[PDB]
Design an enzyme around this catalytic site. Sequence first.
Site, PDB file in Angstrom:
ATOM      1  N   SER A  89       4.484   2.515   9.002  1.00 13.54           N
ATOM      2  CA  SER A  89       4.083   1.419   8.215  1.00 13.54           C
ATOM      3  C   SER A  89       4.730   0.928   7.264  1.00 13.54           C
ATOM      4  CB  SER A  89       2.771   2.248   7.303  1.00 13.54           C
ATOM      5  OG  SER A  89       2.023   1.388   6.533  1.00 13.54           O
TER       6      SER A  89
ATOM      7  N   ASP B  61      -0.867  -7.311   1.885  1.00 12.62           N
ATOM      8  CA  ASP B  61      -0.546  -6.152   1.798  1.00 12.62           C
ATOM      9  C   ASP B  61       1.113  -6.091   1.869  1.00 12.62           C
ATOM     10  OD1 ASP B  61       0.094  -3.350   1.410  1.00 12.62           O
ATOM     11  OD2 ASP B  61      -0.462  -3.092   3.592  1.00 12.62           O
TER      12      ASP B  61
ATOM     13  N   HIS C  64       0.645  -1.247   0.079  1.00 14.27           N
ATOM     14  CA  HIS C  64      -0.140  -0.032  -0.003  1.00 14.27           C
ATOM     15  C   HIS C  64       0.881   1.356  -0.047  1.00 14.27           C
ATOM     16  CE1 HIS C  64       0.423   0.116   4.594  1.00 14.27           C
ATOM     17  NE2 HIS C  64       0.522   1.216   4.072  1.00 14.27           N
TER      18      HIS C  64
END
Lengths: 282, 288
Positions: free
Chosen positions: A224, A101, A51
């Site tokens: 992230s 992901d 992502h």
Amino acid sequence: SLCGMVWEHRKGTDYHKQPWQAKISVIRPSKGHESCMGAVVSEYFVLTAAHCFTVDDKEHSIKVSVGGEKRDLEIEVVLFHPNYNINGKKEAGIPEFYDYDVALIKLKNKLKYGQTIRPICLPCTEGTTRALRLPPTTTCQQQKEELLPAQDIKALFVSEEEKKLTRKEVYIKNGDKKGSCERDAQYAPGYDKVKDISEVVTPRFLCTGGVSPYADPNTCRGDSGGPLIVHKRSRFIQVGVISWGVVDVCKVPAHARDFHINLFQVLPWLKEKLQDEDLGFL
Amino acid sequence: ADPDESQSLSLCGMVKGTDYHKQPWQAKISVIRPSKGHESCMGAVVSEYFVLTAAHCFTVDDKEHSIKVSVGGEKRDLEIEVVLFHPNYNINGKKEAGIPEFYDYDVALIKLKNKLKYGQTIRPICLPCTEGTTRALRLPPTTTCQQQKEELLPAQDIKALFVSEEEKKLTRKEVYIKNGDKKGSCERDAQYAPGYDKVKDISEVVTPRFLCTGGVSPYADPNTCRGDSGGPLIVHKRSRFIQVGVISWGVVDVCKQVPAHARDFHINLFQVLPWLKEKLQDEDLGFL
């Protein structure tokens, strides 16, 4: 070099302590750049979240750096897990779906391992079997039961705040608390009216955060994509990839859960893409 | 008379107190996603049911739960009827040409479900070519759109401002739009912006729908912060505030390298009047 092993000395930069950590910046004119991290997993690859790449321009818009270096490394290609489809559940009321992901950034030039740049260990590999000082009769299932038992697993991730990297100790609810951890996904953005949580939380995710058994720190926006690590026998083994969560507190606590792609659940992809990196996958 | 008078509250571009009393038209917009990489933008209350901002801000197609809009310093988020994007907007419009993100016509309208109740902290800003603006400018009732343009956007360095947010508080930043002989220099610096490394003809990225600010000439101009994006570019023409543009993109963000190349680009509202006029036709705005 030996995967998941740090500088056997005192002090040093944040990269002496976390030699595997990579910084990823995806830039755009609007100024709303993506910020993520990843982990060196071989001389040619950096593992992170799929992502993160919201600008399809590996030539000039994806900035990847390691060892605290300032230079951005040349990218050959970015491989996205084949089953990744973030908008695949839009019609079911799930704006962004984060199943699978994960992505690998393949570098054009081979990395040169030093005291500030070193690979981290991956699941079901020869490195992990040796890092955990286990015998050669060790299988992938055994590594899984050894690293991810059906209990609250002690783990950590690397966080960046105010130009500093710090290890954040968390607990993976893989035991009796798993269910209650996953159910708090209902409080994540866009998931307000998601009837069955199993639809947003698939068997490919590890759940951390919350205040039980302990008050677990939460991943920051910029963290992230970074590795979720298990520290054992003085070695660091990456078990997951930070993907999403309920809230960013770095910016109801019992609800503050973070989700990570369990690397044991994407082994066929990893084994195939890294088959030339001499990591010795089982 | 009482300042809360309904008629007095509908007067566009008018201003102690908090920073929202200072900028009544300012709107905050957050597009949230589980990964935590939320979009942050600003907008401007143009009417009772509309907030104007940039199109690029909307990266999550969910007006029901993922798009948080707030005004008047209120902590509450407003329900959204629909988000309108300029029909000519297409960020991927020139991907094949080596341009990752194309910001031409980067404007969008947020249509709120409930009417905005104007007040000491909530008031619309003036929009180009409308009855309201002509008055704010102290111009005769004969004024035409072109006249307003020559009045607001002369072919020179145009003093202007945008509202920025740094550490909980909002502030006004004075900038100069290069609309005269410095125009070309300003636009050519677009070459240093993200992904535009191999752009030969700058006209490809900087289309005639953009205004250009930033740089160190005539003066050291401040630049927009990531979170100020989609925010109104304003002309403070004598005690009144007129929105002449929508912050769209820039070469760099230095909030929270080469200063002379630090340009910011805004969508000229005069170049999207046909869209503004239509979509806002039932808002009693008196468009010329």
